[PDB]
Design an enzyme around this catalytic site. Structure first.
Site, short mmCIF file in Angstrom:
data_model
loop_
_atom_site.label_atom_id
_atom_site.label_comp_id
_atom_site.label_asym_id
_atom_site.label_seq_id
_atom_site.Cartn_x
_atom_site.Cartn_y
_atom_site.Cartn_z
N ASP A 140 0.83 -1.20 0.00
CA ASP A 140 0.00 0.00 0.00
C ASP A 140 0.87 1.25 0.00
O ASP A 140 0.64 2.19 0.75
CB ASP A 140 -0.95 -0.01 1.20
CG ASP A 140 -2.06 1.02 1.09
OD1 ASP A 140 -2.28 1.59 -0.01
OD2 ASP A 140 -2.72 1.26 2.13
N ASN A 145 0.43 7.36 2.80
CA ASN A 145 1.06 6.51 3.81
C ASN A 145 2.50 6.90 4.14
O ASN A 145 3.22 6.13 4.76
CB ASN A 145 1.02 5.06 3.37
CG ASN A 145 -0.33 4.44 3.61
OD1 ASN A 145 -1.00 4.77 4.58
ND2 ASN A 145 -0.75 3.54 2.71
#
Ligand SMILES: Cc1c(C#Cc2cnc3cnc(-c4ccc(N)cc4)cn23)cccc1C(=O)Nc1cc(C(C)C)cc(N2CCN(C)CC2)c1
Length: 282
Positions: A140, A145
């Site tokens: 991801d 992130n």
């Protein structure tokens, strides 16, 4: 492994930052942590009344972050003892997530120069070289992130999908998937590898040079899946140098074994900079 034990009494919550699948995250102060034991800012994740699955994920995260330590991986300080809530303590990164950071500097909001964009990209690539060296597949990678600290310091983390804020970045293809960041083999066959992480890095480069815009923003989720499956790739941003776009294309080879590896990408990004920042350790 053993995880550093932080006493609950040493943590003072200051402000709530958000909530994910794994509980609320706070800006906090922590005592007896710094070498001077004087209070220092930290981020705290708190899991209230955790299910068994949540407890297991908490333990998996703590062990992973104890083992994965690097300049460009989010820094982890430790956990409190058993109890409610479960508490995990992180280094505080004062500029928050990289996607919001990029957007704050974009035209739709001074701005970021080519040197700054390449430095952001290089730092993420450095973190990914480290992850690949530990045979860790992230699955991801996206600017949402990554965290940003002082001096444009960027580190990779993994926060997952927001619990409290509407998000367009995940689609149920079971599990919510970041399809806009995924290569054909990950979408079609659930094959996740260092090579699918490289694909995602190409998409991160695209995010950086578009100031955080969503990949395939003009497409619905169904259209994204068809688009990626049929081998179309993100278009070159107008302010993106050809050499940087060529790195993206190197990440987006349909055959995973033909993609640039992240060590190659790191070297290229470093050669592309006119005045690459100098890294020191004293
Ligand atoms: C850093 C962090 C935090 C944090 C933090 C922190 C410190 N300063 C700030 C400033 N802003 C934020 C902030 C604010 C808003 C939004 N939307 C995002 C971040 C977070 N900060 C919270 C939950 C999880 C994590 C985190 O990255 N955990 C992590 C990291 C890694 C590394 C190896 C990539 C792996 C894992 N795993 C667990 C789950 N995953 C699916 C598989 C592995 C978890």
């Amino acid at each position: 492994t053993y995880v550093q034990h932080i006493k609950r009494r040493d943590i003072v919550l200051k402000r709530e930052l958000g909530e994910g699948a794994f509980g609320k995250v706070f800006l906090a102060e922590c005592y007896n942590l710094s070498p001077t034991k004087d209070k220092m800012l930290v981020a705290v994740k708190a899991l209230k009344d955790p299910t068994l699955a949540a407890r297991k994920d908490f333990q998996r995260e703590a062990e992973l972050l104890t083992n994965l330590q690097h300049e460009h991986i989010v820094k982890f300080y430790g956990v409190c003892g058993d109890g409610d809530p479960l508490i995990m303590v992180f280094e505080y990164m004062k500029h928050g997530d990289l996607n919001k950071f990029l957007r704050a500097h974009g035209p739709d909001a001074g701005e970021l120069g080519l040197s700054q964009m390449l430095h952001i990209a290089s730092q993420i690539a450095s973190g990914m070289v480290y992850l690949a060296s530990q045979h860790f597949v992230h699955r991801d990678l996206a600017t949402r992130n990554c965290l940003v600290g002082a001096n444009l310091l960027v580190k990779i983390g993994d926060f997952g999908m927001s619990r409290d804020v509407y998000s367009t970045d995940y689609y149920r293809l079971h599990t919510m998937l970041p399809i806009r960041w995924m290569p054909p083999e990950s979408i079609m066959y659930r094959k996740f590898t260092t090579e699918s992480d490289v694909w995602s890095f190409g998409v991160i480069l695209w995010e950086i040079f578009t100031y955080g815009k969503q990949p395939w923003f003009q497409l619905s989720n169904t259209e994204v899946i068809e688009c990626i499956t049929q081998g179309r790739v993100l278009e070159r941003p107008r302010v993106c140098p050809k050499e940087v776009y060529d790195v993206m294309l190197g990440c987006w080879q349909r055959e995973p074994q033909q993609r640039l590896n992240i060590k190659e990408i790191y070297k290229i990004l470093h050669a592309l900079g006119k005045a690459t920042p100098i890294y020191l350790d004293i």
